[PDB]
Amino acid sequence: ESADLRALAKHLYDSYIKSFPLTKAKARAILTGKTTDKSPFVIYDMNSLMMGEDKEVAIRIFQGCQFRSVEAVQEITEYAKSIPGFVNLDLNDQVTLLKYGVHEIIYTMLASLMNKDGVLISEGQGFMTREFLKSLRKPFGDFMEPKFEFAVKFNALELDDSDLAIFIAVIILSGDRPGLLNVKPIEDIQDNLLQALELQLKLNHPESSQLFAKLLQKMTDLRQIVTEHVQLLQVIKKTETDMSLHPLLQEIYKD
Amino acid sequence: ESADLRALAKHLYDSYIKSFPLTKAKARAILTGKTTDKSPFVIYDMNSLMMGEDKIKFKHIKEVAIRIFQGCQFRSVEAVQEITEYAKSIPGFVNLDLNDQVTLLKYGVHEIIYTMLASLMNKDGVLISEGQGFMTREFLKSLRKPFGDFMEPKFEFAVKFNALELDDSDLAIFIAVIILSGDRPGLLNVKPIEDIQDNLLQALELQLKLNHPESSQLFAKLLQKMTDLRQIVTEHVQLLQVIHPLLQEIYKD
Numbered sequence: 001e002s003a004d005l006r007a008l009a010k011h012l013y014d015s016y017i018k019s020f021p022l023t024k025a026k027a028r029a030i031l032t033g034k035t036t037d038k039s040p041f042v043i044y045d046m047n048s049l050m051m052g053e054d055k056e057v058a059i060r061i062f063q064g065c066q067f068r069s070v071e072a073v074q075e076i077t078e079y080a081k082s083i084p085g086f087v088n089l090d091l092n093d094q095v096t097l098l099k100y101g102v103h104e105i106i107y108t109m110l111a112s113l114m115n116k117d118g119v120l121i122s123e124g125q126g127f128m129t130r131e132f133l134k135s136l137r138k139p140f141g142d143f144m145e146p147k148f149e150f151a152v153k154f155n156a157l158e159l160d161d162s163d164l165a166i167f168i169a170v171i172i173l174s175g176d177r178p179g180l181l182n183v184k185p186i187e188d189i190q191d192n193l194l195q196a197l198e199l200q201l202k203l204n205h206p207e208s209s210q211l212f213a214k215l216l217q218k219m220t221d222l223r224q225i226v227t228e229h230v231q232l233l234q235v236i237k238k239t240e241t242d243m244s245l246h247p248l249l250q251e252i253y254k255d
Numbered sequence: 256e257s258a259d260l261r262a263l264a265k266h267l268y269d270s271y272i273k274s275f276p277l278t279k280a281k282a283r284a285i286l287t288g289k290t291t292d293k294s295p296f297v298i299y300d301m302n303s304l305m306m307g308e309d310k311i312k313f314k315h316i317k318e319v320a321i322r323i324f325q326g327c328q329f330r331s332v333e334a335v336q337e338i339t340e341y342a343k344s345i346p347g348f349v350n351l352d353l354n355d356q357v358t359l360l361k362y363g364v365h366e367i368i369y370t371m372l373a374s375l376m377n378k379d380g381v382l383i384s385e386g387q388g389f390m391t392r393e394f395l396k397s398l399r400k401p402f403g404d405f406m407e408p409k410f411e412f413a414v415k416f417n418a419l420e421l422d423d424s425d426l427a428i429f430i431a432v433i434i435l436s437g438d439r440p441g442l443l444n445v446k447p448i449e450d451i452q453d454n455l456l457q458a459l460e461l462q463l464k465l466n467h468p469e470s471s472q473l474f475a476k477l478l479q480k481m482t483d484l485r486q487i488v489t490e491h492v493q494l495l496q497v498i499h500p501l502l503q504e505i506y507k508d
């Protein structure tokens with residue numbers, strides 16, 4: 001049964017590597033100056049942003065964020081389908097779980113791209129500083145800061161990709177999403193994923209059941225970040241009428 | 256090393272029994288009607304509420320919805336003291352920095368209140384006045400504009416949490432784990448807090464393995480419930496923000 005849980009952990013890690021082209025391993029190699037990977041161009045003000053290439057800045061960056069979130073949804077959906085039992089659930093419930101899980105997973109994976117000083121962009125080819133993002137016209141200057149605050153706390157856990165692979169699967173398989181039809185089979189899958197994560201942490205860390213506990217708490221941080229984020233989106237919708245969310249993102253955010 | 260985790264589990268149980276008069280065991284017996292004599296007074300509508308006030312010894316008594324909410328506030332202030340007494344019996348707690356003890360309790364009590372409230376609830380209602388009364392879920396659900404959904408999220412949580420079928424033995428260690436959280440804002444010395452919580456978590460794991468040997472997933476499931484509690488609390492304060500100077504002082508939280 002431990003063996004079943006190890007097999008589940010390995011299946012998930014394999015799918016994660018296959019689904020997500022920029023891993024924490026690669027992000028940390030880029031950020032810490034390892035010779036496996038290359039150095040990013042750093043955008044820290046308006047001039048270096050202009051040089052960054054090769055209708056205002058805040059809006060331009062936001063449309064970029066939108067493009068990469070759309071791709072992330074695609075990657076996460078591919079990953080979700082590999083979680084044993086997911087594709088056998090009622091279709092309505094598959095959609096509900098993805099709708100609520102996608103952004104919580106986005107914030108989780110975004111942390112891998114961040115340190116306290118900024119975030120990797122353009123597949124790790126650029127690095128945009130936290131202070132630059134903060135300087136952006138209101139309320140765009142408020143978007144990324146809560147993500148940074150979360151990322152710094154999440155990254156202190158020092159998880160690697162193999163831990164994250166199971167953690168993300170646990171997120172998607174939440175039986176407490178609004179509007180679910182059959183909660184029991186979702187919870188049955190999550191119970192196994194939770195045990196797989198528990199054992200994975202037990203083998204890989206350091207005070208593992210406490211790490212387990214601290215990691216599970218991050219869900220709450222995640223759902224709070226999402227709530228605060230949609231509120232910001234509502235402001236944007238009202239003040240920037242020449243702008244709207246990509247149809248996929250609109251659908252995710254609808255109710 | 257298994258023996259000192261059992262010794263710790265036992266100390267916590269004994270202290271939990273001392274601190275909290277109405278145990279889950281006694282509460283479930285009242286809720287199932289296994290208690291052969293003292294059937295609780297049932298509050299299912301406005302008239303039965305008013306009669307309940309006449310018969311039971313209430314200590315908090317203009318509008319029914321306000322009056323019930325005020326009774327809940329009185330009870331919670333009582334519970335904070337019960338929980339505080341319990342916390343001081345957790346090995347290591349009184350040796351923490353004094354500010355940190357205060358900080359752990361400040362953020363910890365509501366999560367514990369919710370956990371313990373679940374012991375008093377079934378899907379149909381909740382025990383009041385140490386089991387002397389029973390207030391139905393539908394009567395609560397029927398209350399005024401903002402007060403009708405005050406208890407619903409507590410019930411929904413309680414129904415799921417009670418499905419784990421924890422007994423007082425399990426809950427004693429579980430509550431100690433919640434209090435000893437190293438991620439509360441403004442903690443000065445997190446290391447010994449997390450050292451104690453690590454020990455409590457190991458004691459909780461063994462306890463669940465011994466008391467529920469047929470459910471290997473229970474520990475994981477319980478830890479996940481710890482996180483639900485923080486969400487419910489956040490949800491509860493956003494409800495409170497929507498909702499006699501000396502009384503304001505007594506009930507500042």
Ligand SMILES: COc1ccc(C(=O)n2c(C)c(Cc3ccccc3O[C@@H](C)C(=O)O)c3cc(OC(F)(F)F)ccc32)cc1
Nearest residue numbers: 065066068069072105106109110113119120121128144147
């Ligand atoms: C889950 O997998 C992934 C998660 C994230 C990404 C990705 O790297 N990002 C992704 C998906 C984003 C966009 C983004 C991040 C967090 C929250 C929201 C968000 O986009 C908005 C439009 C949204 O989806 O509501 C992003 C932003 C970045 O910084 C910038 F400086 F540009 F603002 C940097 C990287 C970003 C790629 C894959």
Ligand SMILES: COc1ccc(C(=O)n2c(C)c(Cc3ccccc3O[C@@H](C)C(=O)O)c3cc(OC(F)(F)F)ccc32)cc1
Nearest residue numbers: 327328330331334338367368369371372375381382383390
């Ligand atoms: C931690 O130990 C205890 C935990 C709970 C109690 C307790 O039984 N209750 C306690 C503490 C309460 C009030 C209460 C419970 C959960 C969350 C909030 C709450 O009150 C509000 C006003 C608050 O504290 O902000 C309570 C309410 C009950 O239902 C009623 F019909 F009154 F609305 C019934 C029992 C209640 C006593 C001790």
